[PDB]
Amino acid sequence: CETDGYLTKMTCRWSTSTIQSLAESTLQLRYHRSSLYCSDIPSIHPISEPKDCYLQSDGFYECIFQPIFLLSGYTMWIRINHSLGSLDSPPTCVLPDSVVKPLPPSSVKAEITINIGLLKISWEKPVFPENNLQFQIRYGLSGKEVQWKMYEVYDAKSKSVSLPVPDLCAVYAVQVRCKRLDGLGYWSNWSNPAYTVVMDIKVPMRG
Amino acid sequence: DVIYFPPKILTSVGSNVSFHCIYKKENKIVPSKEIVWWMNLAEKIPQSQYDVVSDHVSKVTFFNLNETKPRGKFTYDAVYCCNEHECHHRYAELYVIDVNINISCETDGYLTKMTCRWSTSTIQSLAESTLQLRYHRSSLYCSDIPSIHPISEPKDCYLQSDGFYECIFQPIFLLSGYTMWIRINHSLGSLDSPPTCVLPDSVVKPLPPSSVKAEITINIGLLKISWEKPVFPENNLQFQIRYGLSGKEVQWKMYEVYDAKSKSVSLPVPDLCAVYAVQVRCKRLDGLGYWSNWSNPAYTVVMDIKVPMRG
Amino acid sequence: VPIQKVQDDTKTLIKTIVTRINDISHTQSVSSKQKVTGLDFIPGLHPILTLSKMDQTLAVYQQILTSMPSRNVIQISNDLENLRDLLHVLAFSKSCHLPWASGLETLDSLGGVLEASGYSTEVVALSRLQGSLQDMLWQLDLSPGC
Ligand SMILES: *[C@@H]1O[C@H](CO[C@@H]2O[C@@H](C)[C@@H](O)[C@@H](O)[C@@H]2O)[C@@H](O[C@@H]2O[C@H](CO)[C@@H](O[C@@H]3O[C@H](CO)[C@@H](O)[C@H](O)[C@@H]3O)[C@H](O)[C@H]2NC(C)=O)[C@H](O)[C@H]1NC(C)=O
Ligand SMILES: *[C@@H]1O[C@H](CO)[C@@H](O)[C@H](O)[C@H]1NC(C)=O
Ligand SMILES: *[C@@H]1O[C@H](CO)[C@@H](O)[C@H](O)[C@H]1NC(C)=O
Ligand SMILES: *[C@@H]1O[C@H](CO)[C@@H](O)[C@H](O)[C@H]1NC(C)=O
Ligand SMILES: *[C@@H]1O[C@H](CO)[C@@H](O)[C@H](O)[C@H]1NC(C)=O
Ligand SMILES: *[C@@H]1O[C@H](CO)[C@@H](O)[C@H](O)[C@H]1NC(C)=O
């Protein structure tokens, strides 16, 4: 499962209806909730509440939880329920906090530093999540096919970076994405591309 | 502890609204000198509009009120009567909505139907309020002089797939005055749209001309295009003919005749032997009316015009 | 679960709830220290130091928010429940017992006030909750006793 940037709902799917061969069996999803984080010790909860939910055209049963408890542990399993008996799939632990993928960073602006001849890229931290994050930079020469050379940033309060380029006049294009620093999380999506404008960086060296 | 009058107000954009308040505390009335007003519990109303009536009642008047944003479930605005220390929980509601909804329609070429429409989906200040049209047909011409116009009668029309509420009329008079407006009712009161009129005779859009033909003149080199005058209406009018080099995408060009008497014109073309497409559009000479819909495409046949100069 | 994880999770939850409160279209600038005659039962104003009053004010906020059926209040209450559970966990880690506070007897006076006016209740409750949570974040660093 994955939590949206707004941290308002949790969505996920199970992938056994099409890939597996044994059809003709009613299937359902059961979830159990604990106030704290789910225990590291393994156990199956005898008490469960059914969560009936629909199917997607791709064959993946997508269904959502509209209200979400951010820091409460969730235990889910799939119940195949045949004519001659029933069986339960192995359980799992899903924590909403350690799952949310952040929204893409906004207001990406790129320009060429004057009298220095370098490229400076600025960004704005997304509103959610409130934890310290890490960023990733992609840039290249504009064209039908663009070459991507990437840089990694491992700081939280750094809102702008300056990095070198081999040519000056050519128009560049940059895109940024964010990810939680600790490691529990999903990478964001690339922001809207930013374009630079050619400017007189320095005086001509020779006549 | 606080009594407000009037409690609810429903006016239009740009109106001029007044409010009053009475404040009591610990069984005593604070004098009107210390009374201040708060709007939306966010910004304080300036003292310039504050006026004093007596030793117990002070009133406020707003100038050129704006629209009200839809803030969640709540759709109204709050105005408070406050001492400089505290503010009571009782507030007076203030509703305002826009009345500027445009209207326009064309007298069809058949001179038997007159259909037009009024949209409100873009407007967000109104909700759960019935809407109904009004009209009037007594004068021969409009815009003679502004009038109070008290007499009115209802009508009816239905919603389409789009939110633009089209309505269809039945036989009309080509020379008459038609002043129409929309009306507003709400739980607090009622309002109406500003009046306007449309003249059916001056808003006629002619039907597209038929029997359009074009062919390059022989031993002349001049492209002559032939058309037919639209049957309705009968007023003098101007022809715009649009033509270019036939193809998937055509480099069109524009030429416009100001004489209604002329029914064919000649013009040299750059390419002597090529497929050509011409089109015909119509409009009123005086400028009162609508452009017509585009005629059917017309073509020609490539065939030799003059003797080749060089062997 | 290590205690430091709970300690940082409390701050993260408080910041998340504060940011969520700062998104509502009514309480952008309404002040957190405004005085209202009728609305005196809403906790706030004077600061609190002990965990007993902490759970008390959190419970009153939860119950006053429960009466409101708005879409964006349900999620705030859901986060407040987890915040209260984390506070109980921290109190247990502090080797002191905290009883589960019951319904405050002054919240039944809200019946007349809610019917008389709802906008004032919304604005005051949201602003006071935001201020109390800012006080939460500031105070929790000192690690006070039970
Ligand atoms: C709402 O009430 C105003 C009364 O005047 C209002 O209160 C005064 C204390 C001032 O703050 C005014 O600015 C304010 O509008 C109605 O009349 C308006 O009065 C003002 C008087 O100042 C008119 O301004 C005058 O206009 C001339 C010519 O343009 C200017 O050179 C002067 O500056 C002069 O003051 C103003 O034109 C007049 N009308 C409007 C629309 O403001 C106002 O009509 C009314 N609104 C309604 C009924 O919708
Ligand atoms: C499984 O199927 C049996 C059919 O006998 C039914 O009684 C039972 O309720 C089903 N359990 C489900 C759908 O979870
Ligand atoms: C990124 O794109 C994917 C498309 O596969 C989408 O499912 C996901 O929601 C997007 N990320 C965000 C934060 O919207
Ligand atoms: C109405 O909105 C315009 C737009 O900024 C503003 O200039 C004007 O002061 C507003 N009037 C009132 C009474 O708020
Ligand atoms: C709607 O308008 C009609 C008149 O057209 C009026 O009689 C009725 O009371 C209005 N509804 C309201 C004000 O709720
Ligand atoms: C012209 O076009 C409009 C819109 O495409 C259409 O309603 C009308 O019937 C057309 N007039 C003709 C085809 O004469």
Swiss-Prot record, chain A:
Belongs to the type I cytokine receptor family. Type 2 subfamily. Receptor for hormone LEP/leptin. On ligand binding, mediates LEP central and peripheral effects through the activation of different signaling pathways such as JAK2/STAT3 and MAPK cascade/FOS. In the hypothalamus, LEP acts as an appetite-regulating factor that induces a decrease in food intake and an increase in energy consumption by inducing anorexinogenic factors and suppressing orexigenic neuropeptides, also regulates bone mass and secretion of hypothalamo-pituitary-adrenal hormones. Residues 32-49 are annotated as: Leptin-binding. The cytoplasmic domain may be essential for intracellular signal transduction by activation of JAK tyrosine kinase and STATs. The WSXWS motif appears to be necessary for proper protein folding and thereby efficient intracellular transport and cell-surface receptor binding. On ligand binding, phosphorylated on two conserved C-terminal tyrosine residues (isoform B only) by JAK2. Residues 104-199 form the Fibronectin type-III domain. A motif (WSXWS motif) lies at residues 187-191. Disulfide bonds join 1-12, 38-93, 53-63. Glycans are attached at residues 81, 189. This is Leptin receptor. It is found in: Cell membrane; Basolateral cell membrane. Isoform A is expressed in fetal liver and in hematopoietic tissues and choroid plexus. In adults highest expression in heart, liver, small intestine, prostate and ovary. Low level in lung and kidney. Isoform B is highly expressed in hypothalamus, but also in skeletal muscle. Detected in fundic and antral epithelial cells of the gastric mucosa. Isoform B and isoform A are expressed by NK cells (at protein level). Present as a mixture of monomers and dimers. The phosphorylated receptor binds a number of SH2 domain-containing proteins such as JAK2, STAT3, PTPN11, and SOCS3. Interaction with SOCS3 inhibits JAK/STAT signaling and MAPK cascade. It is linked to Leptin receptor deficiency: A rare disease characterized by normal levels of serum leptin, hyperphagia and severe obesity from an early age. Additional features include alterations in immune function, and delayed puberty due to hypogonadotropic hypogonadism.
From Swiss-Prot, chain C:
InterPro entries: 4_helix_cytokine-like_core, Leptin. Belongs to the leptin family. It is found in: Secreted. Key player in the regulation of energy balance and body weight control. Once released into the circulation, has central and peripheral effects by binding LEPR, found in many tissues, which results in the activation of several major signaling pathways. In the hypothalamus, acts as an appetite-regulating factor that induces a decrease in food intake and an increase in energy consumption by inducing anorexinogenic factors and suppressing orexigenic neuropeptides, also regulates bone mass and secretion of hypothalamo-pituitary-adrenal hormones. It is linked to Leptin deficiency: A rare disease characterized by low levels of serum leptin, severe hyperphagia and intractable obesity from an early age. This is Leptin. It holds the Pfam family Leptin. Interacts with SIGLEC6. Gene3D superfamilies: 1.20.1250.10. GO terms for cellular component: cytosol; extracellular region; extracellular space. The keyword Nucleus does not apply. Adipose tissue is the main source of leptin. It is also produced by other peripheral tissues such as the skeletal muscle. Expressed by intercalated and striated tracts of submandibular and parotid salivary gland intralobular ducts. Detected by fundic epithelium of the gastric mucosa. Secreted into blood and gastric juice. The lineage of its organism: Eukaryota, Metazoa, Chordata, Craniata, Vertebrata. GO terms for molecular function: DNA binding; hormone activity; leptin receptor binding; peptide hormone receptor binding. Keywords: Diabetes mellitus, Disease variant, Disulfide bond, Obesity, Secreted, Signal. The keyword Secreted applies. Induction: Induced by secretin. Disulfide bonds join 96-146. One of its GO terms (biological process) is cell surface receptor signaling pathway via JAK-STAT.
